Amino acid sequence: EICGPGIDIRNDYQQLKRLENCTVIEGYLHILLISKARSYRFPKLTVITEYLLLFRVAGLESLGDLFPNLTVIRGWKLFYNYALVIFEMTNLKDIGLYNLRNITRGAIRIEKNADLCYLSTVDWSLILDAVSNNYIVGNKPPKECGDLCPGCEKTTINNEYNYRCWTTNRCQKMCPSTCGKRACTENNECCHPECLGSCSAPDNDTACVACRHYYYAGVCVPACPPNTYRFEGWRCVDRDFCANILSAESSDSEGFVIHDGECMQECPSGFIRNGSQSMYCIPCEGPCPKVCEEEKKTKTIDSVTSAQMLQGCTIFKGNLLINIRRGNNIASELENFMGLIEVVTGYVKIRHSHALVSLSFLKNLRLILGEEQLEGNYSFYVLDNQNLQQLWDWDHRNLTIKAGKMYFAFNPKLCVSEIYRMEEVTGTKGRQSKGDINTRNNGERASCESDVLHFTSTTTSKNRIIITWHRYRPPDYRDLISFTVYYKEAPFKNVTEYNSWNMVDVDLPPNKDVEPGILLHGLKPWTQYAVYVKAVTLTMVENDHIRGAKSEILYIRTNASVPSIPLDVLSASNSSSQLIVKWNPPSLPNGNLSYYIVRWQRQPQDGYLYRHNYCSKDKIPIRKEKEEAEYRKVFENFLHNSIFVPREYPFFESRVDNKERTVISNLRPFTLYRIDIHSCNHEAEKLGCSASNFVFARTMPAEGADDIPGPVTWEPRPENSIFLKWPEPENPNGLILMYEIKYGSQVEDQRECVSRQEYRKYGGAKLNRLNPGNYTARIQATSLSGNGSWTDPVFFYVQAK
Amino acid sequence: EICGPGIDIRNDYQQLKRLENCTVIEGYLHILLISKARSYRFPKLTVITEYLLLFRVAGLESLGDLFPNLTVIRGWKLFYNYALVIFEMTNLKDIGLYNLRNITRGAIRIEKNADLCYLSTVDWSLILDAVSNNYIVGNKPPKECGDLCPGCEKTTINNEYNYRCWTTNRCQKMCPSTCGKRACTENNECCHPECLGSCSAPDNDTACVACRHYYYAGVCVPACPPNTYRFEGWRCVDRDFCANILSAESSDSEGFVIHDGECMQECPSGFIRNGSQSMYCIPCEGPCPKVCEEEKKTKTIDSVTSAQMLQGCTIFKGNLLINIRRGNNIASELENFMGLIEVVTGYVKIRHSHALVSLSFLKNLRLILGEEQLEGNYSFYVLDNQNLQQLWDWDHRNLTIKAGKMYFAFNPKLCVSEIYRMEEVTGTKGRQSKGDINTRNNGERASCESDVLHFTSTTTSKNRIIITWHRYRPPDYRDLISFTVYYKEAPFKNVTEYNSWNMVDVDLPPNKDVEPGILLHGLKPWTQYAVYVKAVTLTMVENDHIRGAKSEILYIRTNASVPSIPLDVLSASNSSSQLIVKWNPPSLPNGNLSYYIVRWQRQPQDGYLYRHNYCSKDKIPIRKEKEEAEYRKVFENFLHNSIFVPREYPFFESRVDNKERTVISNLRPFTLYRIDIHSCNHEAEKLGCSASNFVFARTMPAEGADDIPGPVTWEPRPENSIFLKWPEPENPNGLILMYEIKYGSQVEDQRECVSRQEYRKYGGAKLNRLNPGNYTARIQATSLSGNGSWTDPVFFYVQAK
C-alpha cells in the first residue's frame, strides 16, 4: 500500500486516520498543529521517501506511539536539507523511532522541545551520513533530564563511550561487525546486499523491509528491468503508468516524460519533448525552445514582475500588451525576459510606454502573425509613447507581420520615416489606411537627420581630461546653441547611448576664435572613459527641418600612476632553505600589472639570547560601527609620498613576471626573513614602482643538525671528578642554548646542565666529585627549534682507590 | 617653548631636527616613513597635546632614543579614539617612554611590530584610563621574546602579579600609596594636586612638568584667571592672542572667537558672531543663520554633490545657476540643502533643469536682489526646462526681486499664467519686454485649468481594493479618453503628487452604463493607501483648450486580519511565586494592537525522578548563505490556519492592556511554567486572536523550605543499632530526593545515605550495628534546587553492656 504523493495532516487530530493502511509513504509527511484529546498506532508504516515533519503536536509523548516500525526515511526531497524536523513539539519526551535504521539523504533538525530526552543516547552516526550538518538545539538540557536505558550495546561518541538506546524500554538496534556495509535481521543474520534496514528473512530479495536501490515486483533490484523506469527514487513503474500521471494543474500542465530510464515531471534542462506531447525527450541544439502558454488571452506588461513570467520564452501563444510608464534599467531588464521571444501568435500593442525609447529589448522577435487582431484588423498598434525615439527596426533585424495593419498615433519622438522603413521588412506597404500613419501628432518633436560634431583635441592626466570639439553653427541663423557633454566610465567600448551617464553643460564661448571644450575633474588613473558631446539647438522657428548635432563616442583613458601595495602577504615554509609566499593584486593597480618585485632580507638571531645562562631559567624560548577600513585607508594614503625604484644583511631581489606566488631558494635553515613585496606596472619605469607590504617568516629547521656530530670523550681529573668532552654542532638550528648530561651508576639519574657560555670556555663539562663506580652518560643539545637526539652512552669509571 | 599647532615629520630623517627646542608640542606629532642612516635625542620634550603617531620608522630601536622625558600625552584630539599609534615600526624593540605617566584621553594602538617586546611588562592601567579599548595585536609574540627587567616594583595584572618595566635598563616609575590620585616626585614626595606626572620640586605650582587642568604664567591653575581664556586644552591666553589667530584658509575663513571663557575656532552650534566679525558669540533664536560665501561668483548646481555645499545656508553672497538634467529623489534632496536659503544677492538661472517639475525645494527664499544681473539686466532667467510644470510660486509664498527682469523661454509644461502671477508678488509688472515672456514655445503642452474626477464607490478586503469613479466625457467630442490609476502605500496623508507610485492603466468600458473602475491585487492588511485617478485625453485637435482631469487623493485603508505571534518571549524570576516576562510586538500586527493575552500553566514535576533511588547514583539532577529566516517563515505561515478565541493543570489567563511586559503572581516556588503569549487587535473579537509563542520558565526556590522543620529523635533497636527519626519538610523546593546522615563518635566521619523511598517506609533511618560509645549526628535534605541546612547535632549513646 503506497500512499502519496504527499500527506499533510493538520488541525484535526482525527485526520491522522489516513495512515491506517499505508506501509510506504511516497513523498513527505506533515503532522502539524495537532491537539490530541484512544491512541493511534501505525505499525504498518516502515518507509518514508522524502522527509518527515512534525510541528506543534500536543499530547504526543513519543514518536514510537505512532510509527514504531518506521525504518528508512529516504530523504529523496528534503525540507531545506533536512530529512526530519521535530520543532516545537510539546509533551514529547523522546524520539521513539526505535526501528529507524538508515536516513539516506539530508540532516536532522530537532528544535524547541522542552521535554525531549534521549538525544545523546542515540548514535546518529550509524543511521545517517551528514552528522556534521545536524541541528539539535533548544531541547531539554542534558543536565536536567536523566537518560537511563533499560537495565544493551554501546559504542564511541567523540572520545566517549556510553550506552545507546531510543527510549526507556527499547535500545538502539545495531548490526554485527561481520556484515560490514550490509544490513542484518533482528537475529543478526546478514541481509541481502540490495536490502536495507531489517529483514523478514535473512538473505532474500522478497524478504526486505526496504530496498536500498530500487523496488519492483517485491524484489530489490539494483536497476530497473528493461521495460520499467525509475519513478521517484525507490520503485520502478512501467510505461503505461507514467502515461496516466498528471503534474500540478497550471496554464501549460501536461503529462510526465520518460527519459534516461527515469519517469520525471518535465524534460530536464537541455531537452525538449519529441513530437507532439510525446513521452520522450530529444536533445535540442543550443538553446532549447520553451513555448509559453497563458490563460489570459492578452498578456499585459505593465510592471517589472509581469515581464518575469515571459522569461526564456521562444514563442508566445497569445497577445502582447506593453504599458510601461516607469522603470529605469527596464530597457536592459526586459531584454533578459523577452530577449528570446521570437514569434507572437497574436498582436502587439505598445500603449502608454513612456519609459521605452526603443523596442530593442524584443530581440529575436522575427514573426508576428495575426490570429487575433485589434478592432479594425490591426496586428501592430502603438499609441501615446512620449519618448519612443526609434523602433527595434534596425536594418539588421528581420520581421514579418502575416496579417493585420499598423496604427501609429501620438508618438512625438518617433521619426515618421522610421515606420515607413518598418513596412518594408514587415511587408505591409499600402495595406494601412490614410489615418493609420499621420505626420500630425507623430514626429512632431522628432529630430531625424542630424549633423556630426567633430572632436579636435584631447589632453589627459591621471585624473583630468581636457577635450575640445569644433564650433557648430546651427542650421538656422536664429537658433540658440549650447552643448552637453556625456561622459561615463566604460571598461570596454561596446556602449549604448543615453543610464549612469555623467552630464555637464558647457556653453559656446563668446570669442569666435576659441573652440568649445570641457575639463573633467576627478577621474580614476588609467581608466577608459566613453565621451561624446551633443548640441542643444533651441530653434526660435520650430520644425521646418529639426536638426541636431551628435558626436561619435570617443574612448579616452587617463594616465597611469603609482600602484597600490600588494594585498595580504602570506608566507610559509614547506622545506628548509625554501620560502613560499603568496599575495593578492593591489587595490588600485592603475595600469597593467606587468610584474611584481619581491625582496627577502636575512634577519639576525635575536640580540642577547647568547648572553643569558639558560641553565638557571625555567622556560627556554622556542619558535616555529566598524570604521577600521577608513583607519587603514589613512595609512595607505601615506604610502604615496614614498615609492620604490628597482634595479647589515644584504637584500636579494627577484622579479615575478606573472603569478602572485613565488618560492625563495637558498636560505639558512631556521632563520627569520624580512619579505618586502612591491607591485609595479608598465609605467613604473618612470613613475616608480609602488611601496612595500612586508611580512616576516622563518624557514624550517634543518633536521638532525642540532645534535652532537661525534663521540663523547672523558678524562679523569682531581677529586673524584670526570671531564666529558664532545664536539660542538657546526650548523645548529638557530643556536645551541644549552646541553644536558644524563649520567648515573645503575640508572642515568643524575642530570647536569651545561650552559652555552660554559661550553665555550672548556669545550665540555666537568662532573664534580662523583661516587666511585661504573658510570654511563648521555648528552643532548637544545637549540632554538628544540632539542637534538641523545648521544649513545659513553662509559667511564671512578676508582675508589 | 611651545611648538605647533601640528608637527608632521616624514621621509627626511634629518627633518626630525624641528624638535630641538620644543618642550611642549601643541597638537599632534607625526613621525612617518623615516629611514635612519649620529642619533637624535630630545630630552626637552615632555608634554604632547592631542595624539602621537609613529609609522614605518626604520633604524629606531626604542622610543627612549628620541623622547626620554615624554611624560603626558593629553590626547585632547584623538587619532580615531587613539592617543598613541605605533604601526609597522621596524627594528623597534620596546616603547622606551620610561617617563610616561598619564595619558589623559584615548586608547593605544600598537600593531605590526615584529621586534617589539616589553608590552606585557607595562601596567597601562595606571598611565591611562580606557584600558579596555586598547589595541595591541600583531607584535612580537611573548613566547618568542624574553622580557627581563634589570636585576624594581610590581603589581597585579588580572589575577597575576609580575614585574613592571619599560625597557631593559629602566623600570616603570610608580607613586606611593599615600599620595592617592596625586602625583609624586622621583623621590616619592607628593606633587601639588594641580600637578601631573613628575615634579622638579615637591608641592609647588611653579615646579611641575605638566599641569593637569590648565597653565598660565608658570602656574598650574584650575581655571583660567578672569582676563584669560582657555586655549586648546592646557593653557590660558589673553584676549589679544586670539585676535591674532587665523583659522585654515577657506572661502569664508575668519579669526577665532571667545566664548564661555574659551578661545575656539568658530562659534559653537547654536551661536553666531555678535556684530561684524567680533570676538564674541551671541545666542541666536531657533535656527542660527549661516551666510555662505564662495570664490566662484556663479555657483553652478549641476549635480547632487554641488548642492551639498549649500547645506544649511541662509543667505547666498553670489549667483545661483541650476542645471539639473538627471536625478530621481533630488526634488526632496535639494530641499534638504537649499530649503533654508532665504536671500540671494545676485541672480538665479534655471537652465536645462529637466528633472525639476517645480522649484518648491527653494523654500524660505523670499528675497532676490540684483547685485549682478545677466546680460540685458535679468535677475531671474529660466530656459529649456522640458518638465517644469509649476514654479515655487504658490499663493502662500513670498518673493521680492529688487532689481532686474525675468526671461522665460522653451519651458513647455509651464503654464504662461503662472509666470504672470509671479510678477505680482515679484513686483516687476511691466518691467520686462515683449519677448521676455512669450506664449510661443512656452506653455505649448501646458494643461492649466483641469476638470475634477469624482470617485463613486470603494470596497475593501484584507489585500484587495475595488474603486470606481464617474465616467468622464472629454471637453472635445473627438478626444480619445483613457485613465491612469495612481496608488501607493501612504502611512499618513500628507502626500505629494507624482516618486514610488504604482501606476496601472484602465480603459473606459465600452458599455456606457458601467463606470470605469480598477481592482488592486495584493495589499498589506490594515494599511492606508493613497489613490487618485488621472485622465489621459489624447486630443486629435491640439490646444484650443488643453484640458485634463484629475481626482482628489483618496486614502483607503484595507481590512484587518489575524495578527502575528509575539516576537522573542523572554522570562525570568526575581522572586519565588513571581514570574516576569517580556516580549516584542508582532511582525505583522495588521491593526491596532489594543492588548496582549498571556496564559501560564503549571508544569508537573518530571515523571520518574520519584522512582529512582538516588543514593546509588553518582550525579543527582538539579535545575535553576544564511536562509534560516526563510526557514522560520514557513513555520509562521503555518500559524495562520489556527487562531485563539479568548474568554491536567489549569490555565490562568490575564490581559495586558498596554505594555509588552507583565509579572505573574501567586506561583508555587521552584516549579516549571508554560507561558503562552498571544497578540490580539481591535478586530480580534471577530477575526480571532493570534496564535501563541510560548516559553518555559521556572520560579525561584523557596529559601529555607527544604530543610528539616523539627528536632531529630533516636530510639535504640536490636543489635547495636540506632533509629534516627525526623520530620519531613512539608513544602520542599520541588522534591526531596534523599537525606544524608553525618555521624561519628569523635568526628562525624561515618555518613549514611537515606533515599526518598526509604524515608517513606519508616519515617527515618536505622544506623546499623555501631561500635559502642557516645555519638553525634546531623541530617541534611537534598531537594531539586539543592541541599538544605544541616540539623543541629542530636546526641545518642550505644552501650557496650
Ligand SMILES: *[C@@H]1O[C@H](CO)[C@@H](O[C@@H]2O[C@H](CO)[C@@H](O)[C@H](O)[C@H]2NC(C)=O)[C@H](O)[C@H]1NC(C)=O
Ligand atoms: C544508507 O543507505 C545508503 C544507500 O544504501 C548509503 O549510501 C551510500 O553512500 C556512499 C557514500 O559514498 C556510497 O558510496 C554508496 O554507494 C551508497 N550506497 C549505495 C547502495 O549506493 C548510506 O551510506 C547508508 N547510511 C548509513 C548510515 O548506513
Ligand SMILES: *[C@@H]1O[C@H](CO)[C@@H](O[C@@H]2O[C@H](CO)[C@@H](O)[C@H](O)[C@H]2NC(C)=O)[C@H](O)[C@H]1NC(C)=O
Ligand atoms: C599621459 O600619457 C601621454 C601619452 O599617452 C603623455 O604624453 C607624452 O608625454 C611625454 C612627456 O614625457 C612626451 O615625451 C610624449 O611625446 C607624449 N606623448 C604623446 C602621444 O603626446 C602625457 O605626458 C602623460 N601625462 C603625464 C602627466 O605624464
Ligand SMILES: *[C@@H]1O[C@H](CO)[C@@H](O[C@@H]2O[C@H](CO)[C@@H](O)[C@H](O)[C@H]2NC(C)=O)[C@H](O)[C@H]1NC(C)=O
Ligand atoms: C590622568 O589625569 C587626568 C586629569 O588629571 C585624570 O582624569 C580624571 O578622570 C576622572 C574620571 O572620572 C575624573 O573624575 C577626574 O576629575 C579627572 N581628573 C581631573 C583633575 O579632573 C585621569 O584619571 C588620569 N589618569 C591616570 C591613569 O592617572
Ligand SMILES: *[C@@H]1O[C@H](CO)[C@@H](O[C@@H]2O[C@H](CO)[C@@H](O)[C@H](O)[C@H]2NC(C)=O)[C@H](O)[C@H]1NC(C)=O
Ligand atoms: C472590511 O471593513 C468593512 C468596514 O470598514 C466591512 O464592512 C462591514 O461588513 C459587515 C459585515 O459583517 C457589515 O455588517 C457592516 O455593515 C459593513 N460596514 C460598512 C461600513 O460597510 C467589511 O465587511 C470588511 N471586510 C471583510 C472581508 O470583512
Ligand SMILES: *[C@@H]1O[C@H](CO)[C@@H](O)[C@H](O)[C@H]1NC(C)=O
Ligand atoms: C484501509 O483498509 C480498510 C480495511 O482494513 C478499508 O476498509 C479502508 O477503506 C482502507 N482505507 C482507509 C482510508 O481506511
Ligand SMILES: *[C@@H]1O[C@H](CO)[C@@H](O)[C@H](O)[C@H]1NC(C)=O
Ligand atoms: C560589452 O562586452 C563585454 C565583453 O564582450 C561584456 O562583458 C559586456 O557585458 C558588454 N556590455 C554591453 C553593454 O554590451
Ligand SMILES: *[C@@H]1O[C@H](CO)[C@@H](O)[C@H](O)[C@H]1NC(C)=O
Ligand atoms: C595593457 O593590457 C591590455 C590587455 O592585454 C593590452 O591590450 C594593452 O595594450 C596593455 N597596455 C600597454 C600599455 O601595454
Ligand SMILES: *[C@@H]1O[C@H](CO)[C@@H](O)[C@H](O)[C@H]1NC(C)=O
Ligand atoms: C628530543 O628529545 C627527545 C627525547 O627522547 C627525542 O625523542 C627527540 O628525538 C629529540 N629531538 C630530536 C630532533 O632528535
Ligand SMILES: *[C@@H]1O[C@H](CO)[C@@H](O)[C@H](O)[C@H]1NC(C)=O
Ligand atoms: C633652537 O634653539 C637654538 C639655540 O639653542 C637656535 O639657534 C635655533 O634657531 C632654535 N630653533 C631651531 C629650529 O633650531
Ligand SMILES: *[C@@H]1O[C@H](CO)[C@@H](O)[C@H](O)[C@H]1NC(C)=O
Ligand atoms: C508627513 O508627516 C509626517 C508627520 O507629520 C512626517 O513624519 C512625514 O515626514 C511627512 N511626509 C511628507 C512627505 O511631508
Ligand SMILES: *[C@@H]1O[C@H](CO)[C@@H](O)[C@H](O)[C@H]1NC(C)=O
Ligand atoms: C487605531 O489607532 C489610531 C491611533 O490611535 C486611531 O487613530 C484609530 O482610530 C484606531 N482605530 C480604531 C479602529 O480604533
Ligand SMILES: *[C@@H]1O[C@H](CO)[C@@H](O)[C@H](O)[C@H]1NC(C)=O
Ligand atoms: C547546603 O550545604 C552547605 C554545606 O555546609 C550549607 O553551607 C548550605 O547552607 C546548605 N544549603 C542551604 C540552602 O542551607
